[PDB]
Design a protein around this ligand. Structure first.
Ligand code: GTP
Ligand code: GTP
Ligand code: MG
Ligand code: MG
Lengths: 285, 428, 423, 184
């Protein structure tokens, strides 16, 4: 197997065939401009084009000093042209293809998404909103793992920027993990309430419950009154319903990632707040 | 005239205890050094107050074995500074005993030996007791043998080595420790008496009728053989009156310094009443492979030297008559460039037994010392077990971790291959 | 070469760890107050290995009790021997990793670790000559797995010259219904293969199968599994606690059991399981697949090294004979290139309730079956890139999953090479 | 040699007990007077082998300077140091040692009582007659034998008067000693 097969190996977007086809198409006297034209014709993806150019420069012996220099210049030009669009996407080729398979989507689409995400400073919330508008909650977590794989792999690039984006994506993941906690426990709570003849808001789902939980923890100055208030606004005024949710929020607090708390004190303060709310909704035993 | 005994590791310390218990009985010294009242002074210094103190040093990298000597019946026999211990043992790893742990204690041991040497008017040499299989017995002994060669140049160094035996053996790595120590000790020992635990174990079972012999059973048997070898040095003798006389009479080729000791009679205490064995009978038994303390066949090899050390009610004419019968009846083939003779020694002091002890009191006994090429059979057993493990480099990482480069293993084996070829070359 | 420092992490670690203390304390004649009320002087001979002496000759365990889950403090304290433990030796957190390895190894666990290391330091100073450390934990959880393996690495950097030995409870679908267990077990195996000198593989699959198949218990609880763990732990530490020649310290056992540094995972076995048994019947049962605490068929591999411990008053002539027959009759299952690899030890003090017992420690190339079971369970999840955000969110990265996967598959391949290795 | 003596005197200060105990034994065997004050210092050594050897050495030299320090060694914790200090005091033959040796005749250890009786016989002071007569009734037969031997070295009027009394009112061994030594 040649360099073309080595390049095509694991690469779901390039065949050794098209690469050899490209190398064979490029004559020894091909100018840097000629090379790029040919690369562009057979390969539309800049990442794959840049990959092809690496293949081409690399598959060319130093004996063909003129061609290799033309190919090098072509690649240098292509890199000058695309920069990150080519190089960054090329860097995360494996990751994009792997997750494209899990999501049953296009790898280029994921690379585009990645570059989009990494092209600027984005907070966790910006990322969350950016993903919920594009994916199912089920798929979002998987997408977040692609982005994380890509950013980690970019240890070869907006260094400082990616570090911040990774911190923001980890926050996003921590939030999603919290939503998963509610996903499994909310039905149990609602079924147990239902079993005791307690009618609950028909639309009440884990997301609404989880969102209420996060409004509480992210509250700038939370109180037991605010806690109870949000819970009552959430599930209604049934003592067992309010108690159930407050108990769920209290259970959730212990399981929520530390990164989602401004300090260790914040977590304890929230617990105390929830406990006080539970006591307020238990006076009449 | 003086000899300093060095007891290294558990096997050495515990054999030394059995030896000194016997030496004391043999010379009529109580365990407090007092003697209710000169030959034995080569092994015991004499104090004006009454005390006879063993010219001995006891070393172990772990305290537990020597702590028992320090609190034992013989606690007042030795001065405490003669009993030296570390804190952590060599964990059956030669490299720990030689490099890692040994390096810490070596300087102290040497200074204590020097303090003993400075109380000698004419130090003959050293008698070193140790096991092959233990990390301290193998690793620390070779370190010490190397350093003694420097400090006491032209002084004899005689060993009593415990050749490992599966029955009692506590470590898988004992073949490695045995080859490694014998490689580094080879050019620093002048004579080495190997004691194969399987042979001593088999004698206890067969002769002494002990079904499952303990180290205590074995040690009392080893110390009878050790006593027979050193009797010449502790009593006014004619043969082997010197540590140097040992080499001259038993070591014609210098790498080939491993004589095979054979002792007779070894009668059970349970047996008496029984008819006492004659000079002819006890001599005949020396040529029986059952009575050898290393398992091998001399009827497969050739002799280089042969010493007969008698003890008790033995008459010179009876010895000559007994030897004559053995020359005419047995196949005692000597190497082509050696003497066809048997060096004989008689010590009219009867054999001493330990009151209680599994062994019975005898009227006459003999310990024959032979330098046969047949001892290479025991080297080959060890070399094979070493080969099987080294091919897969099993357990080697333990040694490399403890300041030993892997190459020392191959070098050691190469010296063993050479020793095996040397015993082969003698056979012509 | 004297004192051992015991550490128990997580729910499983503390449960199995407390039954271990209950068992050996009763063996050494110690009551939950730490007062010796024994029968033999042998009980106090090597007592300084696991116990420290207080004024009043109150023997206290050299045990460090850790969990990020605060509830485990009370579980231990309210247990039978719960009083015996040093109150300063309870290092407990505010959370409980919730089966997340990253939480125990990087976040919540790494916060508590320094406080644990302070307790390990103070127990290691009041040690004349420290042998090493012994950790009891489950690989399936978050604290026992993540924090436990963080501790192992942190202790190895502080006490590099000491032996690190563990009792690691392998997860099983038959026992725990938690999905992410193969991740936590694969991420821990990765650490253990590089940071421990000897690991006893207590497989929950074998424990369940013994209770279910052999003991006939149709619905086994943790209590029933733990009865087997306590008995196994009591037997494998017998040569350490009572006077002896063979395997007396952690390093002597290591030098005899570990031919290759990575191949240090042991298959513990014990006979009899239920409660008029002869030495041949004991030898026969102790080797039997049905009695191994790790779900591996010995017939699927070869034994590199074996340690057989007989407890009770029996013939040593019989044990030497039976162990020799078990080898010459079953020659092909023992590695040809490691001569005299099966070392047998006799202790006259039997375990409570038995007049005669046998404990087996095997380093069999058949342990690869156990790792393969975890790798198969892991691959199937990591394929779908499942639950990855729970771990990556806590700080760790995907590469650590791929590194743990490769390292465990290299371990299985390594076992296989010596299984097939021709003398 | 004068040099071997100074070398051993220097060794009495060595950190090693093996060196100190050997130096004391060697100095006793040489018998040079120069070693008397350093040996008296060695009677206060931490090591009982050194103390014992120093006591023995001092007895072998026989210098009076050693009498008061050896008298204090009769109260040593070590039974072999005590027994040797008694032997040494008898060897020196100084009268000052008679009252302390009469006390040592009542020691817990029989080897000390035996050496005290031998020493008292060697010194030959009449003050030992009545205490040695009482020692003929010792539980230890060898102590009784040495007390009778010791009175045999003393002799005289105190001995005769004590024997005439014992041959009349004394019983067992003491009676037999009184009748037999009266014939001698
Ligand atoms: N005959 C005899 N052999 C002994 C005795 N003690 C140990 N051995 C043997 O010596 C070998 C083990 O070596 P040891 O000398 O005990 O150990 P060690 O020198 O203390 O070294 P470490 O404990 O490893 O540091 C085995 O072959 C034992 O069978 C003893 O009392 N008699
Ligand atoms: N044999 C045994 N296994 C146990 C026991 N308790 C839990 N397990 C197993 O331990 C694994 C889960 O680990 P846990 O100990 O519960 O987790 P942890 O270390 O406490 O960590 P957290 O979940 O954060 O509290 C599963 O494989 C369970 O089957 C016990 O008492 N004995
Ligand atoms: Mg030892
Ligand atoms: Mg828990």
């Amino acid at each position: 197997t040649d360099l073309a097969d080595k390049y095509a190996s694991g690469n779901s977007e390039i065949s050794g065939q098209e690469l050899r086809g490209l190398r064979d198409a490029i004559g020894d006297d091909a100018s840097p401009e000629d090379i790029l034209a040919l690369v562009q014709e057979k390969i539309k993806d800049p990442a794959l084009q840049s990959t092809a150019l690496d293949y081409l420069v690399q598959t060319t012996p130093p004996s063909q000093g003129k061609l290799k220099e033309a190919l090098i210049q072509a690649r240098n030009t292509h890199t000058e042209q695309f920069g990150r669009t080519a190089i960054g996407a090329k860097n995360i080729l494996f990751a994009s293809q792997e997750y494209a398979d899990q999501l049953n989507v296009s790898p280029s689409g994921l690379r585009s998404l990645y570059l989009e995400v990494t092209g600027d400073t984005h907070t966790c919330d910006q990322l969350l909103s950016m993903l919920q508008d594009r994916y199912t909650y089920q798929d979002m977590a998987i997408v977040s793992s692609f982005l994380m794989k890509g950013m980690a792999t970019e240890l070869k690039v907006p260094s400082a920027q990616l570090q911040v984006l990774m911190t923001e994506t980890r926050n996003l993941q921590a939030v999603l993990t919290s939503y998963d906690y509610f996903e499994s426990r909310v039905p149990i709570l609602l079924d147990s309430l239902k079993a005791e003849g307690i009618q609950t808001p028909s639309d009440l789902n884990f997301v609404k419950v989880a969102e209420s939980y996060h409004k509480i923890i992210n509250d700038k100055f939370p109180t037991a009154s605010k806690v109870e208030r949000e819970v009552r606004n959430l599930i209604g005024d049934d003592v067992d319903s309010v108690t159930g949710v407050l108990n769920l929020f209290f259970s959730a607090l212990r399981q929520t990632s530390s990164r989602l708390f401004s300090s260790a004190d914040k977590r304890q303060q929230l617990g105390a707040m929830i406990a006080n709310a539970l006591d307020a909704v238990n006076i009449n035993n | 005239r003086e000899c300093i005994s060095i007891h290294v590791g558990q096997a050495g310390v515990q054999i030394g205890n059995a030896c000194w218990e016997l030496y004391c009985l043999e010379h009529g010294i109580q365990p407090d050094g007092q003697m209710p009242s000169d030959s034995f002074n080569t092994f015991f210094s004499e104090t004006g107050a009454g005390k006879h103190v063993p010219r001995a040093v006891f070393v172990d990298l772990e305290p537990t074995v020597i702590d028992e000597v320090r609190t034992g019946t013989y606690r007042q026999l030795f001065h405490p500074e003669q009993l030296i211990t570390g804190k952590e043992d060599a964990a059956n790893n030669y490299a720990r005993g030689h490099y890692t742990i040994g390096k810490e204690i070596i300087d102290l041991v040497l200074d204590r030996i020097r303090k003993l040497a400075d109380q000698c008017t004419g130090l003959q040499g050293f008698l070193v007791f140790h096991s092959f299989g233990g990390g301290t017995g193998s690793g620390f002994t070779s370190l010490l043998m190397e350093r003694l060669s420097v400090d006491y140049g032209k002084k004899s160094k005689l060993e009593f080595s415990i050749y490992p035996a599966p029955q009692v053996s506590t470590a898988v790595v004992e073949p490695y420790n045995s080859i490694l120590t014998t490689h580094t000790t080879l050019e620093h020992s002048d004579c080495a008496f190997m004691v194969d635990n399987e042979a001593i174990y088999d004698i206890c079972r067969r002769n002494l009728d002990i079904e499952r012999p303990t180290y205590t059973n074995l040690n009392r048997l080893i110390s009878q053989i050790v006593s027979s070898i050193t009797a010449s040095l502790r009593f006014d003798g004619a043969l082997n009156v010197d540590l140097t006389e040992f080499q001259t009479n038993l070591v014609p080729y210098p790498r080939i310094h491993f004589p095979l000791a054979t002792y007779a009679p070894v009668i059970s205490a349970e047996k008496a009443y029984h008819e006492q064995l004659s000079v002819a009978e006890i001599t005949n038994a020396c040529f029986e492979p059952a009575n050898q303390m290393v398992k091998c066949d001399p009827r497969h090899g050739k002799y280089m030297a042969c010493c007969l050390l008698y003890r008790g009610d033995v008459v010179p004419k009876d010895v000559n008559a007994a030897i004559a019968t053995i020359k005419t009846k047995r196949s005692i083939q000597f190497v082509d460039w050696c003497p066809t003779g048997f060096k004989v020694g008689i010590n009219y002091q009867p054999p001493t037994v330990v009151p209680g002890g599994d062994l019975a009191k005898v009227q006459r006994a003999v310990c024959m010392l032979s330098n046969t090429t047949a001892i290479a059979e025991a080297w080959a057993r060890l070399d094979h077990k070493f080969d099987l493990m080294y091919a897969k480099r099993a357990f080697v990482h333990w040694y490399v971790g403890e300041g030993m480069e892997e190459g020392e293993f191959s070098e050691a084996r190469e010296d063993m291959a050479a020793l095996e070829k040397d015993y082969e070359e003698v056979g012509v | 070469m004297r004192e051992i420092v015991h550490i128990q992490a997580g729910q499983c670690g503390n449960q199995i760890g407390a039954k271990f203390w209950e068992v050996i304390s009763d063996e050494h004649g110690i009551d939950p107050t730490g007062s010796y009320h024994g029968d033999s002087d042998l009980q106090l001979e090597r007592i300084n290995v696991y116990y420290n002496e207080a004024t009043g000759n109150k023997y206290v365990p050299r045990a460090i009790l850790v969990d990020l889950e605060p509830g485990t403090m009370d579980s231990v304290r309210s247990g039978p021997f719960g009083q015996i433990f040093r109150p300063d030796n309870f290092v407990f957190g505010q959370s409980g990793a919730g089966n997340n390895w990253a939480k125990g190894h990087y976040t919540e666990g790494a916060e508590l670790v320094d406080s644990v290391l302070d307790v390990v330091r103070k127990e290691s100073e009041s040690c004349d000559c420290l042998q090493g450390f012994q950790l009891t934990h489950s690989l399936g959880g978050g604290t026992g797995s993540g924090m436990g393996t963080l501790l192992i690495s942190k202790i190895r950097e502080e006490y590099p010259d000491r032996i690190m030995n563990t009792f690691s409870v392998m997860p099983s679908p038959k026992v725990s219904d938690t999905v992410v267990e193969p991740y936590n077990a694969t991420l821990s195996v990765h650490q253990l293969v590089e940071n421990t000198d000897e690991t006893y593989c207590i497989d929950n699959e074998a424990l369940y199968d013994i209770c279910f198949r052999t003991l006939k218990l149709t619905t086994p609880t943790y209590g029933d599994l733990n009865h087997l763990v306590s008995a196994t732990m009591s037997g494998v530490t017998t040569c350490l606690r009572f006077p002896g020649q063979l395997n007396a310290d952690l390093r002597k056992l290591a030098v005899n059991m570990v031919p290759f540094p990575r191949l240090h995972f042991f298959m513990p076995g014990f006979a009899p399981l239920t409660s008029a048994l002869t030495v041949p019947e004991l030898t026969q049962q102790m080797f039997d697949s049905k009695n191994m605490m790790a779900a591996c068929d010995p017939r699927h591999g070869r034994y590199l090294t074996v340690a057989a411990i007989f407890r009770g008053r029996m013939s040593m002539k019989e044990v030497d004979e039976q162990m020799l027959n078990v080898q010459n009759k079953n020659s092909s299952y023992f590695v040809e290139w490691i001569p005299n690899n099966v070392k047998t030890a006799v202790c006259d003090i039997p375990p409570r309730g038995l007049k005669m017992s046998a404990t087996f420690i095997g380093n069999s190339t058949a342990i690869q079956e156990l790792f393969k079971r975890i790798s198969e369970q892991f691959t199937a999840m990591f394929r779908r890139k499942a639950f990855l955000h729970w771990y990556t969110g806590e700080g760790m990265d995907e590469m650590e999953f791929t590194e743990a996967e490769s390292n465990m598959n290299d371990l299985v391949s390594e076992y296989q090479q010596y299984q097939d290795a021709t003398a | 040699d004068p040099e071997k003596v100074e070398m051993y005197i220097k060794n009495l200060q060595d950190d090693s007990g093996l060196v100190r105990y050997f130096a004391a034994d060697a100095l006793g065997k040489i018998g040079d007077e120069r070693a008397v004050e350093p040996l008296i210092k060695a009677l206060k050594d931490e090591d009982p082998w050194v103390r014992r050897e120093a006591a023995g050495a001092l007895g072998q030299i026989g210098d009076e300077r050693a009498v008061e320090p050896l008298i204090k060694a009769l109260k040593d914790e070590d039974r072999y140091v005590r027994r040797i200090a008694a032997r040494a005091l008898g060897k020196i033959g100084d009268e000052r040692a008679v009252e302390p040796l009469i006390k040592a005749l009542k020691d817990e250890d029989w080897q000390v009582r035996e050496d005290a009786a031998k020493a008292l016989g060697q010194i030959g002071d009449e003050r030992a007659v009545e205490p040695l007569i009482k020692a003929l009734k010792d539980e230890d037969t060898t102590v009784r034998l040495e007390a009778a031997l010791a009175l045999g070295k003393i002799g005289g009027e105190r001995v005769r008067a004590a024997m005439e009394k014992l041959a009349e009112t004394g019983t067992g061994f003491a009676r037999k000693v009184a009748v037999n030594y009266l014939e001698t």
